[PDB]
Amino acid sequence: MFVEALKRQNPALISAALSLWQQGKIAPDSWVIDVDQILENGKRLIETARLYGIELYLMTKQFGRNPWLAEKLLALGYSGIVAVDYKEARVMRRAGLPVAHQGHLVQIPCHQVADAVEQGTDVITVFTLDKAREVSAAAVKAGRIQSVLLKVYSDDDFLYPGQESGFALKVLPEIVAEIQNLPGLHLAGLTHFPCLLWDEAVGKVLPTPNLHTLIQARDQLAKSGIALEQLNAPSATSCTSLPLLAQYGVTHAEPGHALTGTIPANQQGDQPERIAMLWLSEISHHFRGDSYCYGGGYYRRGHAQHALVFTPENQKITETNLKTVDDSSIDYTLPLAGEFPVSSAVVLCFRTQIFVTRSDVVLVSGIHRGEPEIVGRYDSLGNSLG
């Protein structure tokens, strides 16, 4: 779904990836990241957010919770890293990086609450009073006051599998009263997910009922004198959606895919953020008239559709399509329409979440200058490969 955008916005990345593969420097099932471009994208996001006075936390899950990229991006002026789960937080803390937000989308396990509080986490999102009590106890024991966000929801919200969580709007005042009575805590604000979603029919990113629930919650609380310093509204945060967030009084947002240009608003390759990643594989074998490339990077919600096949003998690039993929079996290989020579290179570009796949992540700098150089190699879980 991003091959069109890749061809338009970053053909140099295609050339660099293929060149490095031909040199034997990039193995199949690797996402190749244009470091020059991701940093440019990150800067544009910061400059845009600054005008609106919106603070940004960096989301890294989609590019494989990569600590090298996280460190370089943080240096652009981001307020900290938002860790989707405790394993992502683990990568960041091991790297010596600040974690600004933990608890969303995934809560902090009981035996890790004290570490999150003691090591320093700007805000912690809680989904239950029992978890809030755990955070309060840890804060008191550490002689600190921990800021928290509350995840809210209402019955008309978009509630996705794995994200069914939070305090119902009908009980929010009772919850807030409890939170304000816990000694270890400071109620900093609210969050929800997803707050914005791409609408294909309209052709725009639009607010979701979830965002309206967040606003309604803020407004209800304001009637009882509750002032909230943080309204955190993630999902599809990008340069062109930031003004929309600003209109709703959002104070904090969390770019993830925007950093690599891989947002649904960019399918025509016309957004300020340019495509900064592609997936490289190679032809393994043929079977009954079709070619199969090494798998490992397949993502069910990715809308992978188009593939480029590079044959180094003649340096030819041919477009073909992915055939239907069985989501029930492990993706050892992926089917491509048509026969291509064994050991030809393959390029795809689609929406992924690297952290739930087993792809390598290869960091390439200097593409803007025409001097591509590999500056890092990592796995999908954030480990260096050396």
Is there binding between residue 170 and its own copies (CB under 8 A)? Answer: no
Q: Residues 316-335 vs its own copies: string with x where CB under 8 A? A: ---------xxxxxxxxx-x
Binding test (CB under 8 A) with its own copies, winner from 8, 15, 40, 87? 87
Give which of Cl ion, its own copies, none residue 313 binds (C-beta under 5 to 8 Å, depending on kind): Cl ion
Report yes or no: 352 and 58 within 8 Å, Cβ to Cβ.
no
- Strand pairing report for 290-294 and 277-287: antiparallel
Strand partners, 282: 345
C-alpha 163/C-alpha 152 separation (Å) is 12
Nearest approach, Cβ of 303 to its own copies (angstroms)?
Answer: 12
Give which of Cl ion, its own copies, none residue 212 binds (C-beta under 5 to 8 Å, depending on kind): none
Is there binding between residue 110 and its own copies (CB under 8 A)? Answer: yes
Give which of Cl ion, its own copies, none residue 134 binds (C-beta under 5 to 8 Å, depending on kind): its own copies
CA atoms within a 13 Å half-sphere pointing along the CA-CB vector of 252 = 24
The residue among 313 and 326 lying less far from Cl ion, judged by its C-beta, is: 313
Nearest approach, Cβ of 242 to its own copies (angstroms)?
Answer: 25
The CA-based dihedral angle spanning residues 83, 87, 92, 98, taken in that order and rounded to the nearest 10 degrees:
50
Which residue, 161, 219, 158, is CA-closest to 192?
A: 158
With 0-12 CB in 10 A as exposed, 13-18 as middle and 19+ as buried, what is 126?
A: buried
Give which of its own copies, Cl ion, none residue 311 binds (C-beta under 5 to 8 Å, depending on kind): Cl ion
- Tell me 109's DSSP state: P
C-alpha 253/C-alpha 49 separation (Å) is 9
Binding test (CB under 8 A) with its own copies, winner from 147, 284, 352, 365? 284
Give which of Cl ion, its own copies, none residue 278 binds (C-beta under 5 to 8 Å, depending on kind): none
Is there binding between residue 313 and Cl ion (CB under 5 A)? Answer: yes
Q: What angle do CA 372, 378, 379 make, to 5 degrees?
A: 135
Which residue, 115, 131, 271, is CA-closest to 198?
A: 271
Nearest approach, Cβ of 368 to its own copies (angstroms)?
Answer: 26
Nearest approach, Cβ of 340 to Cl ion (angstroms)?
Answer: 9
Nearest approach, Cβ of 236 to its own copies (angstroms)?
Answer: 16
The residue among 75 and 342 lying less far from its own copies, judged by its C-beta, is: 342
Report yes or no: 359 and 30 within 8 Å, Cβ to Cβ.
yes
The residue among 24 and 143 lying less far from its own copies, judged by its C-beta, is: 24
Strand partners, 186: 147
Token output for 291: 């070619």
Is there binding between residue 338 and its own copies (CB under 8 A)? Answer: no
Who contacts 223 (Cβ-Cβ below 8 Å, separation ≥6)?
A: none
Is there binding between residue 130 and Cl ion (CB under 5 A)? Answer: no
Q: Report how many residues bind its own copies under the rule CB under 8 A.
A: 62
Count CB atoms within 10 A of the CB of residue 258.
30
Give which of Cl ion, its own copies, none residue 294 binds (C-beta under 5 to 8 Å, depending on kind): its own copies
* Cα separation values, 27 from 225, 310, 325, Å: 58, 14, 22
Give which of its own copies, Cl ion, none residue 86 binds (C-beta under 5 to 8 Å, depending on kind): its own copies
**Residues within the interface to its own copies (CB under 8 A):** 21, 24, 27-29, 84-87, 105-107, 109-112, 127-128, 130-131, 134, 160-166, 282, 284-288, 292, 294-296, 300-301, 325-333, 335, 341-343, 353, 355-356, 358, 360, 379-381, 383
